[PDB]
Design a protein around this ligand. Structure first.
Ligand SMILES: C[C@]12CC[C@@H]3c4ccc(O)cc4CC[C@H]3[C@@H]1CC[C@@H]2O
Ligand SMILES: C[C@]12CC[C@@H]3c4ccc(O)cc4CC[C@H]3[C@@H]1CC[C@@H]2O
Lengths: 9, 242, 237, 11
């Protein structure tokens, strides 16, 4: 998910 | 956990420092409003705000101690409540209007531009009025917003995966401590402190209600193909499974 | 001037305990398993009967009858499902993993599956029951929270009188916690913990109202006129 | 408006 990725970025 | 070692003053400082910026809308006063363009402006704005929200959450003490999956769940649950409490806060000094952005201030009549919207505007305006009545302070607002983040999804997440939750309750307790500290420093009596604490937390029930109604509204706009929603916004909406 | 504001904390606690509605039974027919229609039938038949008692209870909550009829109607229309739900969660507290709708209707989550879209709601209610159990929620605290829901849920969709009564209930909750031996810090933390659960109860009620609306539309079963009117107040149509 | 709720509240 995009949210998962942004929480990683 | 550094989060659990913070004094009340340090908690306040951390939350104030983590505050996201106030974004501008793409509003062009020359373009006549339509249902589509108004929903366009509001959802374009929400989408940009979501990126800042994600990075704000990372700075709320205790949040990044959680697993990534737990962080995802909490933001999926809380995102619209968080947008809403921010909007109500920005609007507190503008009776009868909602300050979506400094260049986008809307009144209830303008809400009628979009089917089913005016009822949601009215609820938001009433919350703004309530904040005014209580003279809500900035330090109190940032505490409430962090409580929404930590609380809204905490009852909808193995025994090992059960005490991920205990840490959340401990951080929530620290924020309560912080709210009480702010009120004591403001000169309230013990009785006034517990009364105000309850008044503030009861508003969160209303903010949950507004978010549930707003989520159904957004889902309706999607189904009707009123405007295209960003990929992030569609994903955040889909998490509620309406 | 309202008499409610003159009550001591002990007087408020006794009045709320006195006002408590009875625990009702479901049907004695032991036919298992349920169908979607038979389960929704029992649950809605029960809700309808409980609503009559809920109205009687509300009239005995100090401060409620000082409101105009219109305001009384508004608060009950807004809160009725939250009130049924917190009652269910309370009854269920001592039965981990089950929902005690009635003494002869104790259901687990698997039985939730009998009805389309229901197990998600059962799961939320069960989580709330578990949270109350782990907090050792007391009966005196429960009746305070239930009256808070009645007075609070509709108050922002309307004033000072209601807020003054809510303040009195807060004082009463804190009194109970002090009496139980909690430190000042423990009292405010627990007050916060309880009020935050009310957010979840609101969420469950909103989901439950959408579920009941879908059942009405599918013509799953016959709903009482009273139940239909309480559902219609939420304007899902 | 006629409402059962009215009747019950007035009993
Ligand atoms: C989600 C909605 C569009 C985006 C809106 C928004 C957009 C930005 C913002 O900061 C707050 C809000 C709150 C109300 C939201 C609306 C409620 C219903 C509507 O669909
Ligand atoms: C409203 C529902 C039927 C009646 C149910 C009930 C019925 C009786 C009661 O004491 C509590 C509840 C809570 C959950 C309710 C259900 C939630 C969804 C379902 O439609």
């Amino acid at each position: 998910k995009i949210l998962h990725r942004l929480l990683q970025e | 956990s550094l989060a659990l070692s913070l004094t009340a003053d340090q908690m306040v400082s951390a939350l104030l420092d983590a505050e996201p910026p106030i974004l501008y809308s793409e509003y062009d006063p020359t373009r006549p409003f339509s249902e589509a363009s108004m929903m366009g402006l509001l959802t374009n704005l929400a989408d940009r705000e979501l990126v800042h929200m994600i990075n704000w959450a990372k700075r709320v003490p205790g949040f990044v101690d959680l697993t990534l999956h737990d962080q995802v769940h909490l933001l999926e649950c809380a995102w619209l409540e968080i947008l809403m409490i921010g909007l109500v806060w920005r609007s507190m000094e503008h009776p009868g209007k909602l300050l979506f952005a400094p260049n986008l201030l809307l009144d209830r009549n303008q809400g009628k531009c979009v089917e089913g919207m005016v009822e949601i505007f009215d609820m938001l305006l009433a919350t703004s009025s309530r904040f005014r009545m209580m003279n809500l302070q900035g330090e109190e607002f940032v505490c409430l917003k962090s409580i929404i983040l930590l609380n809204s999804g905490v009852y909808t997440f193995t025994l090992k995966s059960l005490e991920e939750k205990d840490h959340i309750h401990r951080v929530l307790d620290k924020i309560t401590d912080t709210l009480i500290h702010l009120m004591a420093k403001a000169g309230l009596t013990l009785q006034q402190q517990h009364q105000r604490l309850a008044q503030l937390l009861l508003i969160l029930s209303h903010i949950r209600h507004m978010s549930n109604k707003g989520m159904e509204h957004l889902y309706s706009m999607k189904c009707k193909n009123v405007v295209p929603l960003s990929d992030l916004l569609l994903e955040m909406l889909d998490a509620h499974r309406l």
